[PDB]
Structures are given as C-alpha cells and as structure tokens.
Amino acid sequence: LGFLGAAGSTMGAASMTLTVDTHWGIKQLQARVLAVEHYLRDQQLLGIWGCSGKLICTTNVPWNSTWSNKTLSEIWDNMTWLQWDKEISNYTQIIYGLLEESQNQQEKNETDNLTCD
Amino acid sequence: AAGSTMGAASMTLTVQARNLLSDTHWGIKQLQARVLAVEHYLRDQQLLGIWGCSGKLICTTNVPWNSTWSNKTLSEIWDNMTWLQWDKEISNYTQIIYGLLEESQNQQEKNETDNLTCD
Amino acid sequence: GSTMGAASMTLTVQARNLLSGDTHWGIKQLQARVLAVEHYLRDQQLLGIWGCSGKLICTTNVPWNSTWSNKTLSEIWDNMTWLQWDKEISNYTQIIYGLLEESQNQQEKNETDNLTCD
Amino acid sequence: XXXXXXXXXXXXXXXXXXXXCXXXXXXXXXXXXXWXXXXXXXXXXXXXXXXXXXXXXXXXXXXXXXXXXXXXXXXXXXXXXXXXXXXXXXXXXXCXXXXXXXXXXXXXXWXXXXXXXXXX
Amino acid sequence: XXXXXXXXXXXXXXXXXXXXXCXXXXXXXXXXXXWXXXXXXXXXXXXXXXXXXXXXXXXXXXXXXXXXXXXXXXXXXXXXXXXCXXXXXXXXXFXXXXXXXX
Amino acid sequence: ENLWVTVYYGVPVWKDAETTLFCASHNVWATHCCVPTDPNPQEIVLENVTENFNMWKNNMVEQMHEDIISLWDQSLKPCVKLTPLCVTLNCTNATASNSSIIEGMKNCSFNITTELRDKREKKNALFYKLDIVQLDGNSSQYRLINCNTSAITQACPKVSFEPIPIHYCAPAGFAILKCNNKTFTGTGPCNNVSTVQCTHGIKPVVSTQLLLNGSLAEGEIIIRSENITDNGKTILVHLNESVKIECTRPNNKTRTSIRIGPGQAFYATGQVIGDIREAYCNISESTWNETLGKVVKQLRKHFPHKNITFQPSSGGDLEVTTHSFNCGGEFFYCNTSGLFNSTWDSITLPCRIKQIINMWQEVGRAMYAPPIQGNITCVSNITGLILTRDNTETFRPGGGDMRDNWRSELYKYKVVKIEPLGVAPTACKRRVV
Amino acid sequence: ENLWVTVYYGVPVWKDAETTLFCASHNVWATHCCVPTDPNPQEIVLENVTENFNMWKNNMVEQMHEDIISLWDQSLKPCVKLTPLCVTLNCTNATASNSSIIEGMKNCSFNITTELRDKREKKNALFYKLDIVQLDGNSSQYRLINCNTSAITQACPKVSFEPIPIHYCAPAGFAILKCNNKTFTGTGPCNNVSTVQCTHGIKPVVSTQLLLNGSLAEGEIIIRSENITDNGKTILVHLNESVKIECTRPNNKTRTSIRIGPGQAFYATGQVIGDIREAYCNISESTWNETLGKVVKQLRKHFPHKNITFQPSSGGDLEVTTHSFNCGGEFFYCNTSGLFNSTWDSITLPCRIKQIINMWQEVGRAMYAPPIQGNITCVSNITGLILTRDNTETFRPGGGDMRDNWRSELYKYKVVKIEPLGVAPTACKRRV
Amino acid sequence: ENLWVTVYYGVPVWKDAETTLFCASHNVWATHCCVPTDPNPQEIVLENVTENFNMWKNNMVEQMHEDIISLWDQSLKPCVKLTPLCVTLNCTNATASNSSIIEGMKNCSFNITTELRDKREKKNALFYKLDIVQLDGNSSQYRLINCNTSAITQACPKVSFEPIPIHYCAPAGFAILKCNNKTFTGTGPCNNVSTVQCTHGIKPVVSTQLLLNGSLAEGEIIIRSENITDNGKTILVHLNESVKIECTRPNNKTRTSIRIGPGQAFYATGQVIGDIREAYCNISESTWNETLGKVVKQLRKHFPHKNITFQPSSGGDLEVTTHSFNCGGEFFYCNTSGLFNSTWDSITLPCRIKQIINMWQEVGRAMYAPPIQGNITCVSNITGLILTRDNTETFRPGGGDMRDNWRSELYKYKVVKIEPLGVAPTACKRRV
C-alpha cells in the first residue's frame, strides 16, 4: 500500500501504514509559509504531549466511556479511521487538552525538590 | 497565569506555548508577520536544542546557580514571586547563563563523543 | 574543510547561524527568509528520519560499504579534509541517505511490534 | 480489476517449476491473494493462499510441502514456487482475488490461468 | 464433502433447468458458500457473492449444509459449469464437478 | 483501569478543504506555469472507499478561472494602449478587386498625432463593421465600438495565447482525489476513487456554444446537470467520440503600421487579398446527425417523450448567439443555427471575424487583436456541447460564463486536507521509569 | 543552598513591543478588513498584574493612522481622474430657488474634451466658492483650487466610506493587554489588567474639534493630557454622557455628469431646489451648557483659580478653525463659535460645504467629493472634546493631526510580545 | 564487523552558489540600503584552504548590476515626465558675452501647454546641440532626440545619486569567501582565503574608459583578462598608485522654470556666463607618462616582443568614444585622445556636456539631467584603465557594458552555500 492506501482498511490494519508575476509571488509565498506552519504545528503538538519522534504515543490519560463506549474488539476491527474520526470529532480538543495537562504534570513531578528523578 | 507565582504558573506552561504559532501592500505585511512568528518559534526551539533541553517544557542542567545572579532560597522565589518579577530581578545575566548552558552542553556532547561508548 | 577531516568540537555556531544568526524588493526579501527556514527544516527532517533528532553526531546501524571508499579508517580520519572527503564520496550520498532511512524504518518497525507497557 | 497468470513452467514429474502472476488495476495489497487449479477433467480447488496485506501464508494439505505462495505486493505481483511436482500436477493454475481486506473472503475474480506439464 | 456437487444438475434441455445442487459441512459451518461458473475452456467468474447473495442471473439460496443455484431457465448462455464452494477453517471446500448444458 | 489514550501519527484521514493549487507544465502559459510536472506521476487506488463529489460546487473551477483572468491581464498589461486612437473616423465602403465588395468592412481615415505633439498625420486602415459604430444620423463619421466604456489595449504580437496542457498540483499537506467511475454524472458518491498529486493536463481552451479539445467520456454520452429538470440550469453534454470541425479564413491579410506614440506601434489591416468569404467551418453532416441522435437518445432517459427539438440560440450579443473560438490567433463568431435546428457530405457554418475583443463579461477592459498576415486554417475536436433547456422540450446551444468550459475537465477532481494526527483507546498505559 | 539552573519554556512573561496588527470586521472598510471576528471574543483577567500604559507613546495609534491613510489612497486610486477639468472657468452668480440670491455658489462654464480626442464641448457645473480660485483681478475667469498643486481624483460613488467598527488583532506570539481602570488617565500603571486578542472595535470616525460617535467614559469625565501644565499639548476631554447633534442640508441637489473619457465621467452639480441657508447643525440647549458645566468642574482640578475662558479657534485654515466631518459622503465645515464663547431649545451653527478635499495633512493628494442628489440629514453623538490651552486660562477648540482622534480609544490597549524562555534555580542537577 | 556509517552535523564544507545578497550601509543609495553593517566584521582565515575563484563568472557582479539598474529606475518613477516638450523647436545661435559666439549652444523657442489645459505659451530654453536633431532637411526646426524613441523622465530635483560605499552581505546559510592573494589575477586557485559576512564598501561609480574612485592594487600593477590572447576580451588594468584627475566647468549657469502641468516644471537652462570652454579635465603629464610606462612594462610580460602602442577609441557614439562620468549633476564626455596616443606640466582633456542621458543603454528609457546652477569642479582618482587589444600590439581605451566596472572591485569575492551534513565511516555500531 501507498499514501492513504489504508483509508478503506480497518483501524487495526491501517496501523501498519503509519510510516508512509507579483501576485504569483504572493501566492507562492503563502503556499510555502502555510506548508511550514502546518509542519510545525504538528510537531509542536507532539512535542507538548511528550512523544515527538514516535508514530505511536502511549499516554497516561484514561479513555472516557463518554467519548466512546465501544470496546477494542469493535473499534480496531469493525471501523475505519475515517469513521472513527467522525465518531470522536466531538471531544477531540478535550482529549488533546488532557494530554497536554498530563505531560506537564509529569515533567513537573520529575523535577521535584524532594524526589527528583 | 502571569498573575500567579512561580511553580504554580509552572502548571500552565503548555497554554503559553500553543499560542505561539498561527492588495500587495497588505499581502506583504501579513506574510512578514507570519514569517516573523515562525522565525521566533524556531529560534527558541533551536536554542533549547543547543542547550541540550530540546522538546521539553522543563529541563535541568549542569550549570550551578550562585549569588552573583540572585542570593535567594528556593522557598523565596518559588511560590512567593511572580515570573514577571523574577524576570526583572535577574534581568541582565541572562546572556551569561545562556552562554554557560551552551558551554556545558558542548562539554556533555564532547564527553560522549570522546568516550566512544557504542554497541 | 577549514581544517583536517578531524571532527570539530564546535558545531553549534554553524547551526545557530542558520536562523538569521520597493514591492518586488519586499518579495525578494521574503523569499530569502522563507528559503532560509526551509533549508533549516529540511536538514532537521532528514536527521529526524535517521533517528538523529537532537544530536550533532549519530552512530547508526548501516555498515560502511567498501565500494563507497575502498579505504580504511586510518586513510580517512586525520588524513583527508572534510571538503576532500565530501568530494570523494559525492556519488554515494543518496545511497547512504537511503540506507539510513531504511535502517531507521526497521528499528521503528521493531519497538512498534514490541511496545513496552506499564 | 485485471490479472494474468504467467505462463506455467512445464516440468517432468517430481521436477521443480515455479508459478508467477501479475496484478493490474488494483491496489494489489489490500485484498488477499489466492491460487487454485483445475486438474484435467476436474473442477479447480485451492492450492495455496497469501495474506497479501501481510507476510502470512497458508496452503492446502495437498501441496503443503510441494508449493509456496507469496505476495510481492510491492511489485503488484504474486508467486507460487513449487517442487516435486506430482505426476498428476498438470492442472491449470488460476490467480484469484480473495478480497477480504477487512473480512469475509470469497474468490471474487479469476485470472485466465496456465498449466505446467507434469511429465517430460 | 467437495460440495456434494451433483455431477450434472445444471445440464438441461433448452428453456428450463433444475437448480444446481450443493451440500457441505462448510456451508453448514458458516454462511460463506458461493457459486462460480465457467464456460468450457475458461476461467470461472463468480456466479454469486454468496449462495444467498448477488444472485442476479438466477436466484440462489442455502439451508445450512444444503445449497442450490437456481437456473436461469436454460438459456444457451447458462451452459457453463456451476461450481459450489465455501469458506473453511483454511482455504475452502470446492465442488468436484458441475456439468452443465442448455 | 484499562483503555488508555494512545496517539497515532500518519493516520489515513482527510477532510474537505480549499487551498491554493499551483500551476505546473513566448507562450503565455508556458512562461507563467514555469514549474515542471512530475515526469512519472503516481496514482494510488484507494480500495473500499466511497467519496462524495460535486462538480458544480468545486472550487477548483473558480480558482482556475481566477488564475486565467490574472494571467490574461498580466500578459496584456505591458503593451501598447490605443487610447490615442480615438478620433472621429471618416469611413467609406471597403473594396476588393473590381467592386464594392467587402460587405463586412470599411475604409476609415483619421487625423492622429505623430512624432511631435504639434503635428498630426492622416492615416487610414480597414476595420470590421462589427467593431465600429456610427456617431449620428446616417453620416460617414464613426467611432471604435468600445471607446466610450473602456480603454482598448493592443495585444503584443509576439505573445502566444495558444492553450497548452496545464496540470494543477496540490501543495504539501493536501491531496487531490479523483473519481474513476466511467458513468459518474458529476454529483454524489463515487465508489472508485484514487489519490493523485496533480490533475491531468487540461488545455485552457476558450469557447462558447461547443466545447473544443477536451477529454472524451470513458463510457457512453453523459448528460450532466446540477438539476436536469430545472430550466434555470446549464446542461453539459460530454461526448465519447469527437466530431472533428475544420475551420478557415481563406484570405491573405496585409498589415500596415501606424506609430501612435514614442515607441508605440498600432497594427492595422491595410489590404485583404482573397476569396470573398470572410470565414467558414466544415462539419461532417453524417457525423453530426449521428452525434446528435446519440445525444437525444440519452436526453430521452430524463425526458422520455418524443417531443425534443433543437433550436438556435435566443437573442443576445455574439458571446451567446454564436460559437466563438480563437483559431490561428484570429477571433471567430460562427453561426450554428444549421447544427441546432432539428426535431426528434458536410454542412458549412458561415463565420464572422472581430478584432476588438471584450473577452469575458468585464467591460472595464478590452483587447485589440492585431491583424494576422496571410491565411488561417485549423482543425479542432468537438468533445461536448453546452445546452440550455425550456408541452415540448426545446434545447438551445446556449452557454455559460466559461466556467463550464473548465468544469467539464475538472469535474472528477476534489481537494482534501490530510489530517495525519489522531487518537484512539488501547489496552496500554505509558510506562514511566 | 546546592542549587542548579533549570530551564523553563512556556513561561508567562512579556516585553513591550510594536508589531503588525491585522483587522477583523461595496464598503471600503469591510472590503479591506475582510477578516471575520471571533463570534465569542474571550477576555482573560490577569489578577495581581500591574502594567504601565502610555497612550501618548502608544504605537497602535501609529499603525491605525497609517492603515487608514493607506486604505483611502488604495480605494481612491482605481477611479476617475479630474485632470481634464484644469481649464479656465467662466463663473457668474448661480440662480437660487428664486432669482440669483444664492451665496456660496457660482455657475461655471468651460470647454472640455469629450470621449473623442478631436472634439471639445461646452459644459457647465455649479461649484462652491471654497473650491474655486480667481485667475486675475476683475475677472470671470477662475480655476479649480487644486490645479495649482496637483491633479485630483474623484471618489467613485460605488464605494462607501461609512465607518464600521474595526477590531485590531495581534498575530501569534503577541497579545494585547487592556486597562480596566474606569478612572485611568492614560499614563500611569493599571492595577486591573486583562488580555484580549482583538480590540473592541473602533469606528474610524474623522473629525476636527468635537469627537463624534465614540465610547463614553465608564466613570466621570476624564481630562487626559500628556502634560496638563504645558500649553503645547492636546487636552482630550472624554465625556461620560453624550450630546446629541443633528446636521442637515435642506436642499435637493441635482447630480448630473460630464463625460471626459472612455468610461470616465465627472459628477457635476446642477440646479439645487430648496433653501439657501445651506447647511447647519442643531446642538441642544441646556445640554451643552450642562456638559460644559461638568467639564469645567473637572478642569478646575488642574486650574483651581477658575477664571476659565472658552474662545473660538484663533485662526488658521478652514480645516482647523471649523468642525469638520463627513455627513453621508458630504464634507461639512461648521463654525462652533457659538459654543466656545463664554468666560467662567437649541443653538445652531452655520456650516459650509466643500467638494475638493485636502485629506489628512497633505495638499496634493486631494479628492473630489461628487455631489449627493436630494437633501441630507445626519445624526451623531458628541463623545469628547479636543481642547488646546493658552491671571486667567483660555481654552480653544483646537485639534491635532488625526492621531488625537484615534488616541481616544486606543489608550486602554497595549501590545506586548510573549517571551516563553527563562530560567530559575531548583534543587536538582541533571543526571545521566 | 567494523566500518559503520556515522552522521555528522556542522561539518565545515560548502558548495558554490548563486543567491540573493542583501545591500547594507534624499540619497537613493542610502535610502534603499537602509540596513546597517557590522562595524567590526571578522576575517576568518582558513588554514591551508585553496579555493578556485573566477572574476569573469562572478554572480555578485550581475547582482550588483541588477540592483543598480532597478534602484536607478525606481528613483525616477515619482517625478515629472517631459513628454509635453516633444514639440517643434525654432532654434538659433545662443548668445552670452559678446553675442552669438557660444559653440554648442542653441536658443530654442517653442509652444508648450501651460498649467491650464486650454492655454499655450511660447517659451525659450537654452540647449546643447548634442541633444538636438535637425528636422525637415537643412532648416531652422529641431527636435529633442529622445522623442524619436521614448518619453524622457526628468531626474528628480531633490534626489541625489552620489555614490556611497555599498556592502554586499550574505543571507543566513551563506558566506562570502574572500581571496587575500595580493597578486591574484582574477581566475584560478587562491591559496589564502578568508571568510566574511559582508564585502568592503564599494562605491557604485559609473564610468567608461577610465575607472574612477576604486581601491588600488595591493601589489604591483595587475593586468586582468578572461583570455589575454583573445582580442575579443576586455583587459582591465588595476593600478597600484592613483592618478589625480581634476574636471571642471568654469561657467556660471542659471535656470528658469517652465510649468508644464499641475505641480510640474521643466527647469530649462536659462543663461550661461563665464569662460566659455564648456568643460575640460586637467591630468598631470609626468604622472600619466610614468603610470602608462609601468602599465606597459607589465603588458610586456604577455607581449614579450616589446612592440606596443596606444591609440584613441576607434568609434561608435560618445558612450564608447569618450570618457564619461557624472560630476555633481552634470554628465561629462571627455576626448582622452591626449592620453592614449603613444608608442613604446599637464594635459588638458576637452569635454562636452549632455542633458539627455541614455543611461545604461536602455534605449526605451532616458533621463533628463536638470542643469546645475553656478560653476563646478570634481576631483577624482583614476584607479584603473579599461583597454581593448587589437607586429605592434594596439591598445585602445574603451569600456564594457558596466559589469566590467564592478568586476574590478568584486573579483576577490565568491559566494558559497554552507552544507552542514555529511557522513564518514567509524568503528562503532549503534547501541540497541
């Protein structure tokens, strides 16, 4: 499979493909700048969550049954990633906020004056 | 967060980071604003990289603190002072500390480079 | 280059200098600034895919091929300059980079297949 | 949407031979791949399968030792090397799309097929 | 079972024919039985998605071990082998034979 | 507990999005779309996906439209203005050997400023009737048709406006999805979708009533409309076979040159030597009848009544009443009433020629097409028709705003943003040492 | 103590800065400031933060100033030039509603080029005296006042300049601090500060003496100056109650036109039907006196000896001696001497009208305001006054170079740059 | 096993590159090159580094040329066009002092449109005959020569083009290598190379046959050519000692003012009084002869048969037959034949003045140089010569296409791109 080749696959199967002229001058600069901003925005966010460099991040935030009450045997085998994104389109920013809080709490705990590393 | 105290405000470091990223006359003014925001972001990230901190919010290092910079106990500055006040108390010095952080990391990189400890 | 092919102990100066230390004029200046950023990022992206994020030097799992030099370590280190070396192996740069990418992909396939949990 | 078996490699009984197949107009990866063959005057039956979406494989007991199966997904191609041809091995081997990228395999489509001699 | 295929159920006089007969433990085991057909000297085409699905030329059905494919009367175009097969623990069950005429 | 959050990056998810595509491929487009294309582009089949397309709401059409307009103006901007060429013109009947022959042209003379601002010279040139108007009464005093609304810029006779294939390419972070369903009608779900980075090469051909030099339909003739039963919508007919239209101007045009300023030369027609036919097009009659009959057969699937007829266009100017095209650099306005007059070896369409061209509906600008020396011939492929519709069902060779001309090629493409980051639950908690 | 440096990123601190701000919103303002606002703007209170604000050094004013001037030039640029009108005009007394009794207008005839370059036509228009300068003594020959310095541009009656609130927004990496002290005087620390991304929306209203349609003070009347003692300073009086003012021209004007080129046309004034008093403005009685009552009461806190005198502007160009404003596209110049004339149901001021406008502070970039057909009435709120000062004290309805009108609302806002890095000691050293 | 790939970042290597350099420091040069330079740039000397330089292919020269043409043109945009002056001129012999004795000057009358578009006036102007072409046979009527090809823009009265030192600076990621070999000939390996951020300050001086106000050679006189053997190439002679050249126009010029539009005027020459010589230059005789003899001694190293002669420029227009330069606001053209005439106390070089300048040989553009009032003297330093060679070798003066005038300063600089990544074999394999 190539780019987006796994789009019609189940979420589980798809986990294996994660590794895959003045006005003109203004338009070209806008395109270049946005490409950079999109790149940096994803990196900043993975950085904040404390897992930059990884395609799969294991975190310490519990999954809320509110976000989804489906089990793993349904989510990973009976859904695609597009469907999943729709299911949890709501609460995505909550999950992201919790991940940010968790990482910051972890880094703070690690520098504690009594029990550092 | 700016109204709190150091060490309490340390619990808000992420919200202060995520807000740093995003007619030819107007088009240039806006492109300049976007480019400048990117330059500043990258400058801070590169500098953290150089000091040996990299993609972390909080990093300890190998540079000691002394009275020259500020003769305070941890109990006085943490939780009894605002980051803004701290920035004023240790205004100046910043460029010295930054220089020391780089030198310390250069030595750390050199120690690993010289030891040649590998598979 | 500025000296022998010996590793230099000062690498951070070269790196920090990359980030910056009449309508058409304004466009040309933006193009220059944007390109400096793009060049900076392309080197960082390339290092990242080799598992070198955050490092100024990396030991890797790709063996050196004799067809890339036909020389031993003593014939290169402290014998040649960095410019001479760069010229000698200019036909293998893409090959080496491709192999480094593949090695890292195998390392990342591992770990993924063997994640450590609590 | 299209496939073709490579011409079969004719061989003497108990001799080695190898099959190959080309895929077209498909991802040739999401779907599983399969082989089946019809003996003279007989219906076809499965000989082997390859989990083309993966590196896994399976084989009919009849050819468990005699034939291989693999999916060269990178090349939009598949193969089935074989050895020790049964004298009664002159069957027309067809390529098939087993589908089931997510679930529920069936032979969705067949290639024209080719038979190797099993005598010479 | 080799689908317990009838040797020549699909073999019939012009304009009418019997459903092709099939029976297997594999068909009983899962609803994964399906029909395929081939002209003489030709690769098969799916005839049905399942014994009970996409039976567009003629109807088809299953009853645990039993299965059948209705004939499209006995159109000359219907004169193709009517093989039955079903998913198994590994590979699939296949009809030994399925003669046809129209 | 169980079910912990895990983050995945590189996830095959996308959302509808609008971005700026870049253009890649003496020619105006060759100069502008300087960016090369991928010599070996890939197409990725997305197995088991369905996507929703809508060609009538496809912003790629709008974006290409705006880029074409900007290029057109950029190209003409650094050229000679004909602003000083606007004086009363003293006009008489144009002639050809032995008589008062050129029924479509006038012999116009005028007093125009020369090298010095205190002197004028009397100059004369041939002009087309379609581009000139009378000032009053029944006098011989005339004005150029647009020198009351906007300035006319002379196109630089060195610039080529010949359409070349153009590929539109997505920027990083974006991809273009393409619909590969042979019977897709322009809207709704498509069950055979692939991903590409660049579109196929589309020639930015300008035309009105007939669509020229496009792609042919993979399947049978497809009738496409936003709402086919709505008389307010345009119907595009996409043919699966071309017609082949040959068209010419059987005359040798001879140029003169008038200096109208300090380095500004106005090109004008001096004399015309040739047959007394201004222009005409050759369409095979049998081909046309077969083609039209096939179109009707398909229209009858939406309008299953034996009451279909084709009539000539309703009144308007020669943007909507004629078949307009650029052939050899010349501007033709052809009468198609002989093609669209029916009820359900060749036919000649008489054609007229203009030099002052108000291309597009914005009257704020106008172009003067300099005369082209010698004679012009070309062959084009009719790949589709534009029809409008309104007891019986009357179709006419009506037309749109030239977005339709591009929609007919861009209909199978959609732009989406890639969103590689996302989350899901897993039975694994981060291990912190 | 055995302390070590710890590096922090995302530290909530800032430094003062000047940056490029962007706007959020046929109208020129809407066309340029095309960016939508936040439907639900946020505001964060920064408890225990003290910040020094200084409106007289606030560069947000300078950015607003430059963007407004730039927008006007861009808006007017793609329009009709009036260069062809710099011809001798034959000007005689214009007919009023009855006979030739209308003052301020002249009926001017002239020879102007038609769309065709080889023809001239005799055309005429009425003009205001304020836009016309005599060519010689004892003569009917006149020229437009601009032809002495520059060609001018007609404003196209396609584009509206009607002010709408403009929200100025900081870019990523920046924030706008806002002062929430109801009695803030413009130069001291604010002990109640909040952070916003965009300002509240300031209407770019232009005037010379009385500030119209602004926000009223939350508290009592505030007298703001950089230095109250210094006479060479603008004094801004920010009222806590508005004074209603109504302005009108009860005369139906005829808008007609002269073609000057290929799609180029000049809008001329034809016969006008109605009164001959021209324009005037109504300021309520025992409203103005009360308002001034309150203002003086506050001035007395700086000038305790009283003896406060209000005089008319001392002199200078019409643009600085009168109250100028844009009324529906028409430019009014109102006297005001009836207001600023006192030592310690309505009053009306006569107003004059001009069509050739020297905008901002520069002659040579002048605009021609086309006539507006029919009659006009404007209603507006007086929200502040601009005073200048000279054994008594004299105040004048003086004014500044536009900056002072904008530095009337942009006093509560400051732009700061976020500085995410810093260090502090902790008890833990880094370890391998 | 041994021999593993190691990745390095910050490796001190570079590649030749073509990039955009930036310029750093009422004057156009100063206005545009607003960016300040480092007062203390360093020269980082590269021990044992050899670099191949090539003056003749140096992209920095092209960049300097483009910046100059672009700036020059941009500076003339917001000023009066003299198009209205392209009318028939009625010319006679100009007078000064003792009547019609001024060779080269004409007294021309013409009908010019005045401030009002409906009026014409007869005006006089004093012109150089070099800028005027006779019309309609051998008659009294004349034309300004630019009107035949293009409109002429008047040089802006308030804009100075006086050369100031200009430094070219590398963008981040780039560096400039400088050749420090005192005898370097412009091409080939330089064995003493330092790296800098900016070039030295080079003035954008414009001249033809003689190069003025450059830096002198560190070593002995250097003859630089792309190919010394090839007669089709320019030979630059870089002197190690300067020659003083004093150029003067001992005449008191006065100007008039003819308004040609709403805020525009021509600034025609009015009258001339003084020593009617129309300019000349003073060059010391012994200095020149010794200087030239030293140049010949060096030419003899390429031309060992010792048979060398110098002849005057062979032909073409004044831009190639004379020495041209801009002295204050006037454009001088000097004969130079008094210098380049020999085989192997002062010399006065007659000069002429022009006002219509085909600057940079654009053709489609021209600039009008307003007269400068009063009397003028300029003293310049001759730092190099431009020669073209064609038994006896004949050398004639003659300039290039302007690029040659900047090669003489930029010859020692090269731009390279920094490339921090690379690999090398090591003994180590990566740990798990």
Ligand SMILES: *[C@@H]1O[C@H](CO)[C@@H](O[C@@H]2O[C@H](CO)[C@@H](O[C@@H]3O[C@H](CO)[C@@H](O)[C@H](O)[C@H]3NC(C)=O)[C@H](O)[C@H]2NC(C)=O)[C@H](O)[C@H]1NC(C)=O
């Ligand atoms: C879904 O869309 C796909 C495109 O993304 C279609 O795939 C195309 O099918 C064509 C056959 O139907 C292929 O043509 C053949 O290509 C091979 C080489 O790949 C040549 O040797 C063959 O000669 C040629 N066939 C002919 C008649 O010449 C296309 O190459 C192939 N395109 C891609 C990208 O693979 C699917 O067919 C389409 N499916 C459905 C159901 O519509």
Ligand SMILES: *[C@@H]1O[C@H](CO)[C@@H](O[C@@H]2O[C@H](CO)[C@@H](O[C@@H]3O[C@H](CO)[C@@H](O)[C@H](O)[C@H]3NC(C)=O)[C@H](O)[C@H]2NC(C)=O)[C@H](O)[C@H]1NC(C)=O
């Ligand atoms: C420091 O500045 C703060 C603003 O940045 C002031 O906080 C504001 O106080 C207002 C009351 O005086 C609040 O208004 C009320 O808001 C609620 C919803 O939050 C509405 O239901 C009420 O109807 C409304 N009250 C009225 C009379 O309309 C503002 O919402 C509140 N603003 C914010 C951002 O919280 C502080 O009061 C000020 N401190 C001092 C000492 O003045």
Ligand SMILES: *[C@@H]1O[C@H](CO)[C@@H](O)[C@H](O)[C@H]1NC(C)=O
């Ligand atoms: C301000 O100080 C009070 C104590 O005086 C404290 O309770 C409050 O939390 C502080 N505000 C912030 C933002 O920390």
Ligand SMILES: *[C@@H]1O[C@H](CO)[C@@H](O)[C@H](O)[C@H]1NC(C)=O
């Ligand atoms: C131009 O004038 C000439 C005069 O001989 C005449 O023969 C020619 O027909 C005229 N042409 C036009 C276009 O008026």
Ligand SMILES: *[C@@H]1O[C@H](CO)[C@@H](O)[C@H](O)[C@H]1NC(C)=O
């Ligand atoms: C030229 O002037 C008007 C401008 O709108 C144009 O519509 C018209 O056709 C021309 N004049 C006439 C009335 O012929």
Ligand SMILES: *[C@@H]1O[C@H](CO)[C@@H](O)[C@H](O)[C@H]1NC(C)=O
């Ligand atoms: C101006 O003069 C013209 C002359 O024809 C006359 O018709 C017009 O009514 C006059 N207008 C006024 C206001 O006097």
Ligand SMILES: *[C@@H]1O[C@H](CO)[C@@H](O)[C@H](O)[C@H]1NC(C)=O
């Ligand atoms: C040009 O001729 C006029 C004639 O009136 C005379 O006054 C003027 O002085 C002359 N100027 C020159 C420079 O000869």
Ligand SMILES: *[C@@H]1O[C@H](CO)[C@@H](O)[C@H](O)[C@H]1NC(C)=O
């Ligand atoms: C020439 O001009 C200068 C300008 O300073 C003036 O001082 C001098 O007197 C003038 N000479 C004559 C002869 O007028």
